[PDB]
Design a protein around this ligand. Structure first.
Ligand code: K
Ligand code: K
Ligand code: K
Ligand code: K
Ligand code: K
Ligand code: K
Ligand code: K
Ligand code: K
Ligand code: K
Ligand code: K
Ligand code: K
Ligand code: K
Ligand code: K
Ligand code: K
Ligand code: K
Ligand code: K
Ligand code: K
Ligand code: K
Ligand code: K
Ligand code: K
Ligand code: K
Ligand code: K
Ligand code: K
Ligand code: K
Ligand code: K
Ligand code: K
Ligand code: MG
Ligand code: MG
Ligand code: MG
Ligand code: MG
Ligand code: MG
Ligand code: MG
Ligand code: MG
Ligand code: MG
Ligand code: MG
Ligand code: MG
Ligand code: MG
Ligand code: MG
Ligand code: MG
Ligand code: MG
Ligand code: MG
Ligand code: MG
Ligand code: MG
Ligand code: MG
Ligand code: MG
Ligand code: MG
Ligand code: MG
Ligand code: MG
Ligand code: MG
Ligand code: MG
Ligand code: MG
Ligand code: MG
Ligand code: MG
Ligand code: MG
Ligand code: MG
Ligand code: MG
Ligand code: MG
Ligand code: MG
Ligand code: MG
Ligand code: MG
Ligand code: MG
Ligand code: MG
Ligand code: MG
Ligand code: MG
Ligand code: MG
Ligand code: MG
Ligand code: MG
Ligand code: MG
Ligand code: MG
Ligand code: MG
Ligand code: MG
Ligand code: MG
Ligand code: MG
Ligand code: MG
Ligand code: MG
Ligand code: MG
Ligand code: MG
Ligand code: MG
Ligand code: MG
Ligand code: MG
Ligand code: MG
Ligand code: NA
Ligand code: NA
Ligand code: NA
Ligand code: NA
Ligand code: NA
Ligand code: NA
Lengths: 111, 48, 122, 50, 78, 52, 102
RNA sequence: AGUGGUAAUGCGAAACACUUGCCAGGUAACAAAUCAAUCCUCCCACGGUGAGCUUUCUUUUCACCAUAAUCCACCUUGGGCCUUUUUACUUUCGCGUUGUUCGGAGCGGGGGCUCAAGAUUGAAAAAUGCAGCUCUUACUGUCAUUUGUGAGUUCUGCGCAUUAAAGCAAAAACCUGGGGUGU
RNA sequence: CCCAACUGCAGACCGUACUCAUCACCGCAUCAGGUCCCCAAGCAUAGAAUGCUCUGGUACAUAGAGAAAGGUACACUCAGGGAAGUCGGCAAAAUAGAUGCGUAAGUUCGCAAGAAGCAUUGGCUCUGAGGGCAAAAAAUUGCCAACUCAGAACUGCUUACGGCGGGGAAUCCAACUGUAUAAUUAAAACAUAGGUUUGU
RNA sequence: GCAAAGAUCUAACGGAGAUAUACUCAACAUGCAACGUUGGAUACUGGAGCGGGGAAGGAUUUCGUGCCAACGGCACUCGUACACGAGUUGUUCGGAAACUGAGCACAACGUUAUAUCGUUUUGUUAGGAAAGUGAAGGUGUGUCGGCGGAGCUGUUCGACUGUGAAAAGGGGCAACAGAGAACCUGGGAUUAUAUUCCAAAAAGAAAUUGCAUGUGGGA
RNA sequence: CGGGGAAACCCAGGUGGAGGCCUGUAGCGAUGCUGACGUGCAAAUCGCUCGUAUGAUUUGGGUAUCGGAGCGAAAGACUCA
């Protein structure tokens, strides 16, 4: 006979925030323990793809607040915000677009 | 309630649990520190 | 499971054999014999019962040299090279006590790992 | 069920205290006219609905 | 709960002011010294009985020592 | 409720240090990463806002 | 405290022995559709995973190269081999022919 | 007044410290079906303890055989990425799914980085729980015991995620960075 | 003053009994009506169908005696005939699971279709087929789990639990799925996609 | 008439509810019929349950003892009846403090003989002066580093004030199933409450806030 | 994945799992018996049979629109018998 369980906290609805697991206790009882909600993790900007960043953990609220700064970023520029391919694109684009402005401005000054 | 137990009965309450009764009164469960015997203070109160 | 079974194969069921054998079960019948309930003829019947009622390889009676019985010092010893459950010799004991009609007078209990013992109801 | 305002719980508590019979010694007063509580309430007869 | 790795670390724990008691658990294999500090219970596991007996005698008498046994229902009622 | 695509276009604030993020009805052919020019001196390309 | 009343599985366990040997599963005992008792997608998934598992092992053992594997990988998906033995016999035919061209 | 690695990115006992002066991103934050499926459930096996049946059968039938949060170290699966070879793709390329794919805008192969689910080890913790049993009265002591290529199971993989003239709330609060302070 | 590893002290406020229904709520009531959410065992079986069962629960619904007529039924049977009954096949009967074969007109080519129809089905004892892992033409050598299908021989049937379409030929209407007169009308009515017109 | 939801039987005990008799008479033919509890027997519900939880609604019906006048459409010794006495324990559970939503409508303004009317989220009140908060800098205090000869000058961080960059768009409510939320096992801990009770071996193991003291590192 | 074909293209096995698709639980309804009842269990219920059951689907709480007015896939339906 499969034992039947009851809700143990005052909320009794099967929502995404009220998910429980069945737990066998040292007293050989089957109880319900609430599943902690999860975060999706640190992502890149939605306009840039919305992809999970490398070297960053997925922590929720209290966990992200008490964790060290390295669980949520890298040592590279824009660490924990942009990815390695997005940072390299900006470094190249910052230098190359600036160079074109210098060449065009010098050409104007020479004429 | 913890301060009033100090002034009235010269005891320390390490825990107070309170409920409001179904007749409207509030009842307090006052646990004393191990330094104080609750039976000795009950005798001094007069409820023995 | 791997090979489909046959109904004719029930005439011989392969039993597991211990790699390092000599497992011994002891049934202590001292208390019934001390009081006189288990007399010498009953002691012989008890030893004889286990000889021709213990099913080895699905067969009852042909114990071969794999199962040895030796009733010494009022206890029964069962030394085997096969994987025998200890519960089998408590189940075989009750069949003897039921046939002799003392299942309501003598109870079989467990004392140690590998030993059973015959007592009286409290 | 479990939820009620404290104000609602305190109205229900007073109604519980009023749900008592008349004391026996009230009937022995000089000009007494009360024999039973005419304002007795049962949860299955009449609803307070607080 | 926290686990103590070395003997030097164990002695530092027992010297703390928040070291109410040491509970000595005699498992058949190893001996555990569970030091009841304020926030954490620190346990040093010693597999060697000869070494474990030396540590129990070397515990300072200032800190309370308790031999962990199986207390009965009747020993704790009322 | 609308059948035409909408475009979020990122501009800088002309007076402050902040971005603006307009939202307008996209013309056909607008793509992400396109540069949108709005003003008197804007060129005549698809997606640009010019005086009539 | 009395024990629970008996609910024995002895009759079910002897029925299981008979059913494992093939009894009580005939055409007159079937109440559900053929692909409700064993779905056809479960039979296909089992076969295709078996065929792909063998092809990966033959490639890892250098019995076939990447060009024989890729040809047989798509033929397996195209329902060319009925079982593991059918695929192996085709592999042997390929190997024997490749020996003659050598 | 941070630092190591070619790189993916690593390192926390306290200067790798302050940032709601300011700015920008992210979490919160939402999504089908198929297929794998977690905790648990049910079945098998294996073995102990007790009980049931035993004219006759049944190495038998029934019950039980539990391990809560919180931390420590940390090889299995799946994804993203890095470096190296790319002389990787046609009169005939390769890798992979049950399934509609993918690749010089970098497939496969070697070696690694990281993330997510889990093993596994330990502290907790057996000192607990359960059942039996012994002495002999006391809600008394002592002592014994503590595998599944099976079937379910939406937690999870899992989304720029469903039919779509359907495209699937927001905010507080928190996280990281850019600039700057430290200088 | 700012940081970590601790430590000391403090952690206020309200709810918390019981119920959640064939007796706790609404219906005048302890009313066969109504009322949201969670946990959900074994066997048969495709199964949250249906039937029976271990755990949990229950024996509470005024009862006893007891073959009158006439009734009601989540009850049956009926020789010969077979819709002759009746406004009308109302009601009942009937078909029926699974597998193989086979299937018409018409058609918007999707259907019609389970069209219509034939056949097999049990129990036993076997035989094939469908796999995983490990070991240096390994195209062999051992070991092993969970089921399924097919084919035989023998041997039965009183055709024998439950659950489970009757079918065909036409005419009228509405294309279709939907809605809709709570408490006499579910329809051909209403909606619908499609078509047209108007104002701006 | 008190006929849907199958169904009860037996012994013992309890109870005033029995085995209750002018004469005659051995017992049947003269005390019937019905209760509650326990043990057996039999059955039903059959996990979409006459099972164990909660919301709305109810509000003491919960628990123990006593009780049988009226009530439970028959019965009662039983009872959700009556009487008396009890029972609801939280840093972490739910709510609030403390989020926004469909929405509401205080202020403001307008209107109305009449405010008891209208606007009041498409970033957002009001012809509309609704910011009382504050980067740097200047002035003193405390905690420091540094140079030169425990004191002084400049310098980093906190407190204090006379100058004041920048922050457009009043104040609220509305979710006990959305967001958010630091505790979970054992108990011999009850007659009734328990992730709420347990006290030194807390049965115990934790996690979190807010302040302080000391040690260590910077200032 | 095969087979035909000069080409255009055609034809066969499997895979996949679409549909205001079908059968059928729970749910949501209410066709017939013109059955039961009709001083009822019930001021609309009961039984069997029946419609639908992935969707224009069913449902909790909250919120918005009412009296010559509200709301209505339209029955003068519904707006606390
Ligand atoms: K509650
Ligand atoms: K609860
Ligand atoms: K009222
Ligand atoms: K998902
Ligand atoms: K899914
Ligand atoms: K009812
Ligand atoms: K069967
Ligand atoms: K009745
Ligand atoms: K009759
Ligand atoms: K009759
Ligand atoms: K009959
Ligand atoms: K005929
Ligand atoms: K006629
Ligand atoms: K047919
Ligand atoms: K139109
Ligand atoms: K009657
Ligand atoms: K009495
Ligand atoms: K079930
Ligand atoms: K709780
Ligand atoms: K107003
Ligand atoms: K509510
Ligand atoms: K406590
Ligand atoms: K309804
Ligand atoms: K809704
Ligand atoms: K009104
Ligand atoms: K109006
Ligand atoms: Mg994710
Ligand atoms: Mg409280
Ligand atoms: Mg409730
Ligand atoms: Mg209320
Ligand atoms: Mg298919
Ligand atoms: Mg090829
Ligand atoms: Mg998302
Ligand atoms: Mg654990
Ligand atoms: Mg409570
Ligand atoms: Mg409760
Ligand atoms: Mg109940
Ligand atoms: Mg309920
Ligand atoms: Mg009833
Ligand atoms: Mg009522
Ligand atoms: Mg079967
Ligand atoms: Mg069923
Ligand atoms: Mg009854
Ligand atoms: Mg006839
Ligand atoms: Mg009919
Ligand atoms: Mg045709
Ligand atoms: Mg015509
Ligand atoms: Mg129609
Ligand atoms: Mg339909
Ligand atoms: Mg209707
Ligand atoms: Mg009608
Ligand atoms: Mg019409
Ligand atoms: Mg037309
Ligand atoms: Mg009568
Ligand atoms: Mg009647
Ligand atoms: Mg009845
Ligand atoms: Mg008596
Ligand atoms: Mg008599
Ligand atoms: Mg039964
Ligand atoms: Mg059912
Ligand atoms: Mg039930
Ligand atoms: Mg139920
Ligand atoms: Mg009661
Ligand atoms: Mg009565
Ligand atoms: Mg009362
Ligand atoms: Mg709003
Ligand atoms: Mg507006
Ligand atoms: Mg305005
Ligand atoms: Mg609020
Ligand atoms: Mg949401
Ligand atoms: Mg919530
Ligand atoms: Mg809370
Ligand atoms: Mg209770
Ligand atoms: Mg349909
Ligand atoms: Mg009708
Ligand atoms: Mg009628
Ligand atoms: Mg009548
Ligand atoms: Mg139909
Ligand atoms: Mg249907
Ligand atoms: Mg239905
Ligand atoms: Mg009309
Ligand atoms: Na409650
Ligand atoms: Na039962
Ligand atoms: Na007729
Ligand atoms: Na009884
Ligand atoms: Na009272
Ligand atoms: Na389908």
């Amino acid at each position: 006979s499969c034992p039947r369980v009851q809700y143990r906290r005052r909320m009794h609805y099967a929502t995404r925030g009220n998910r429980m697991k069945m737990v066998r206790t040292p007293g050989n009882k089957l109880v319900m323990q609430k599943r902690a909600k999860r975060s999706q993790g640190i992502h890149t900007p939605w306009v840039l793809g919305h992809k999970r960043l490398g070297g960053t953990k997925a922590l929720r609220h209290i966990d992200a607040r008490l964790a060290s700064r390295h669980e949520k970023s890298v040592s590279r520029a824009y660490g924990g915000v942009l990815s390695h391919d997005q940072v390299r694109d900006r470094v190249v684009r910052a230098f190359l677009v600036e160079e074109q402005r210098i060449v065009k401005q010098a050409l104007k000054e020479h004429s | 309630i913890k301060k009033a137990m100090r002034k009235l009965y010269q005891v320390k309450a390490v825990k107070v649990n309170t409920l409001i009764r179904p007749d409207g009164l509030k009842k307090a469960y006052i646990r004393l520190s191990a330094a104080h015997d609750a039976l000795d203070t009950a005798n001094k109160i007069g409820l023995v | 499971v791997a090979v489909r079974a046959k109904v004719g194969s029930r005439s011989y069921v392969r039993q597991k054999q211990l790699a390092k054998g000599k497992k011994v079960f002891k049934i202590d019948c001292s208390i019934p014999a001390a009081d006189g309930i288990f007399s010498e003829d009953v002691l012989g019947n008890f030893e004889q019962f286990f000889q021709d009622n213990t099913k080895l390889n699905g067969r009852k009676g042909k114990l071969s040299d794999k199962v040895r019985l030796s009733m010494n010092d009022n206890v029964l010893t069962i030394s085997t090279t096969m994987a025998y459950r200890k519960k089998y010799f408590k189940y075989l004991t009750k069949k003897f006590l039921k046939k002799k009609d003392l299942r309501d007078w003598i109870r079989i209990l467990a004392t140690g790992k590998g030993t059973y013992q015959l007592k009286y109801f409290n | 069920g479990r939820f009620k305002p404290l104000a609602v719980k305190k109205k229900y508590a007073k109604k519980m205290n009023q749900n008592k019979p008349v004391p026996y010694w009230i009937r022995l007063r000089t000009g007494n006219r009360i024999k039973w509580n005419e304002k007795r309430r049962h949860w299955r007869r009449t609803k307070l609905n607080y | 709960p926290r686990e103590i790795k070395t003997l030097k670390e164990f002695l530092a724990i027992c010297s703390r002011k928040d070291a109410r008691c040491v509970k000595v658990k005699h498992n058949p294999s190893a001996t555990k010294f569970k030091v009841r500090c304020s926030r954490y219970l620190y346990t040093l596991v010693v597999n060697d009985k000869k070494k474990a007996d030396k540590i129990e005698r070397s515990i300072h008498p200032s800190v309370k020592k308790i031999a962990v046994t199986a207390r009965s229902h009747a020993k704790t009622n009322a | 409720g609308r059948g035409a695509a909408l475009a979020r276009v990122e501009f800088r604030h002309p007076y402050k240090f902040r971005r603006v993020k307009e939202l307008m009805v996209a013309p056909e052919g607008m793509f992400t990463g396109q540069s949108v020019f709005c003003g008197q001196k804007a060129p005549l390309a698809i997606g640009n806002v010019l005086p009539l | 405290r009395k024990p629970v009343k008996v609910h024995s599985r002895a009759r079910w366990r002897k029925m299981k022995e008979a059913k494992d040997m093939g009894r009580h599963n005939g055409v007159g005992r079937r109440e559900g559709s053929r692909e409700a008792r064993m779905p056809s997608k479960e039979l296909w998934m089992r076969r295709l995973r078996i065929l792909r598992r063998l092809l990966r092992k033959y490639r890892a053992d250098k019995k076939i190269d990447r060009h024989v594997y890729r040809d047989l990988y798509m033929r397996a998906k195209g329902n060319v081999f009925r079982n593991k033995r059918n695929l192996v016999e085709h592999i042997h035919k390929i190997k024997n022919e490749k020996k003659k061209e050598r």
